[PDB]
């Protein structure tokens, strides 16, 4: 129930309306990533780099297995059954992730029966038939590079240089990998890890993983760029150096009787000065309730806002009174920079601050003037069929509000200062004045 007519005079021109939708109902698939390549067809002079690489990988991967083994040891069937005394400290999300891990262990056990076949894979991407209808997907790191560069040139170069090149490739892979799977991975028991982060074990190529799994949907890009596709590590093998990851594919469901409204800020004039209004630019209206939205964590689209979680945020009563037509409770800030917007377009109607920018009507050839008692001017074709704003000429529509828009004034809010350091200064000044009144009262 926003009052757009009053909000427009303080330079809050309404924008487009968007829908609100959140992910739900995920489907699951399992993939296998092998973190060590196969060097059989070039093994004659690989040197001792592979033993050192295995030594590094074992130390990298041991803490993950150690953390996974906590929930695996203490989960049984009493239908998922847990022992709270042994776990000790946990959160709700971690408990749910442990339940999901227990459920995924059933398929992990079947996948683990093909360990010999997994060890012998010699291609970047392979598919193994576990059954007539079931397939296992295996992805190997640095296999393509070896097969395409090192094997072909094994005879044209002394393989001391080949050993050096293999060592550099392995070290670069480890350097890229450490940013995600290192000590930063404090809690592997969770499903908030995105597929893009996991794909760093495959050189950052999540497109290959997604197209090999065969996920094809209209909202694929929207789900991908909103961090809605996530994965979970369910098994770590310290002998063959491979991991099993379950991937979740949710769908987007639209919340009914909910939408997000945008406001375009425009500077306005008051007492020979230029001001802007300090109000939220995105408002989440759900049923009839007005609240804030953490729009920075979501994905904005032409006609929708996609989030992986509900980001509703409470709103003060004074701001709610502001948004419903009480313009005297809306704070404003002074403008000292030369780079701020001075006009905007809404439904073919032009809202401009014709004091800071020259306005002219092409049909009559005479300028458009703004009085000192007005904040903005509403320009439509009832007074100017086409207007010139500097280097642009635009034809205008008709306003659907009050006929007397340019003759009705409104009340104005109090000035503010939103700088971080100014916030600390304003608190001190108020507190000192508060103590002065306290002593004078006493």
């Amino acid at each position: 129930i926003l009052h757009y007519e009053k909000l427009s005079k303080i330079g809050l021109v309404k924008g487009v309306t968007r829908k609100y939708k959140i992910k739900s109902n995920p489907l699951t698939k399992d993939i296998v990533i092998k973190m060590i390549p196969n060097v059989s067809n070039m093994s004659q002079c690989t040197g001792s780099v592979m033993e050192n690489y295995k030594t590094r990988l074992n130390g990298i991967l041991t803490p993950i297995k150690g953390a996974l083994e906590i929930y695996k040891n203490n989960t049984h069937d009493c239908g998922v059954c847990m022992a709270g005394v042994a776990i000790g400290i946990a959160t709700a999300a971690q408990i749910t992730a442990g339940v999901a891990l227990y459920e995924a262990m059933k398929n992990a056990d079947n996948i683990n029966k093909l360990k010999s076949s997994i060890e012998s894979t010699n291609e970047a991407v392979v598919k193994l038939q576990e059954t007539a209808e079931k397939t296992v997907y295996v992805f190997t790191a640095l296999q393509d590079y070896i097969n395409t560069n090192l094997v072909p040139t094994i005879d044209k170069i002394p393989c001391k240089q080949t050993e050096l090149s293999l060592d550099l490739a392995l070290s670069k892979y480890l350097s890229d990998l450490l940013f995600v799977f290192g000590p930063n991975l404090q809690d592997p028991v969770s499903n908030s890890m995105t597929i893009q982060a996991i794909s760093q074990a495959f050189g950052g190529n999540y497109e290959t993983l997604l197209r090999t799994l065969g996920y094809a949907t209209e909202d694929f890009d929207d789900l991908l760029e909103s961090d809605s596709i996530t994965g979970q590590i369910i098994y770590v093998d310290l002998s063959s150096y491979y991991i099993i990851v379950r991937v979740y594919f949710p769908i987007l469901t639209e919340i009914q009787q909910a939408y997000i409204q945008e406001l375009l800020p425009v500077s306005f004039n008051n007492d020979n000065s230029e001001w802007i209004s300090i109000v939220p630019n995105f408002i989440l209206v759900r049923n009839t309730l007005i609240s804030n939205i953490e729009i920075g964590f979501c994905l904005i689209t032409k006609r929708s806002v996609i989030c992986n979680q509900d980001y509703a945020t409470p709103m003060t009563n004074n701001m709610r009174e502001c948004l419903t037509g009480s313009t005297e409770k809306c704070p404003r800030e002074l403008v000292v920079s030369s780079h701020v917007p001075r006009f905007a377009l809404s439904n073919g109607v032009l809202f401009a601050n014709c004091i800071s920018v020259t306005c002219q009507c092409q049909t009559t050839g005479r300028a458009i003037s703004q009085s000192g008692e007005q904040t903005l001017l509403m320009i439509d074709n009832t007074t100017c069929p086409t207007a010139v704003l500097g280097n642009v000429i635009i034809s205008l529509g008709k306003y659907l509000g009050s006929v007397n828009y340019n003759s009705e004034g409104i009340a104005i809010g109090p000035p503010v200062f939103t700088d971080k350091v100014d916030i600390s200064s304003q608190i001190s000044s108020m507190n000192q004045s508060l103590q002065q009144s306290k002593d004078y009262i006493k």
Partner: antibody
Amino acid sequence: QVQLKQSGPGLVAPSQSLSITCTVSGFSLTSYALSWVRQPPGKGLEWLGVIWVGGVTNYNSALKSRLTISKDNSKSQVFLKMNSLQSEDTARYYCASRHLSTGAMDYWGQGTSVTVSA
Amino acid sequence: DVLMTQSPLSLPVSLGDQASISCRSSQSIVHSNGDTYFEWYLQKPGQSPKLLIYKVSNRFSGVPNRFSGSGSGTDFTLKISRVEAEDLGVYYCFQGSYVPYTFGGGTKLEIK
């Protein structure tokens, strides 16, 4: 190298049971699936069934559920067991290994001739 | 089930000519994972069948370049550029996508 050996009784009286053993060498049953194929004397090849790595088996639907296939990883042997043999079942039986990827039967055994008669 | 039709039944061809064998399926044999498991086998008399083309267009190790496989959808063809004496035998098209797996009718190569 890899090679396949079959063994069997050869002559089977009608309405009795048939047992054929295929012994693998050069590769392990934990990394290959095995299929059974038979050929009538004047007909083309026919598919009987396959046993996967995990022990799941699939059979030809037309064989009237008279087939069962089992394997022994420790002895590296796979056994073909058939009951209610009749005159129509006289054929040359092969055991072939199916690759986990590319799904091809790349290795074949020498075959065992089975005759059902009085 | 998937019925496999192979024609011609017999292909009388003189030495050095081109041979083309076509095998057709009653329905699409694309597996749920995207692959198409289709193979060609050659059986010499008194010998076990051997693998020539282990996918639609993938040639097995040790197979001469004279053999080339191609096809899509429900039509698959095998082309022999230069017919030789050792190529005489029976050719089978085998599908391995949907249970039960089925063999082709078999094409008998014959010297004209």
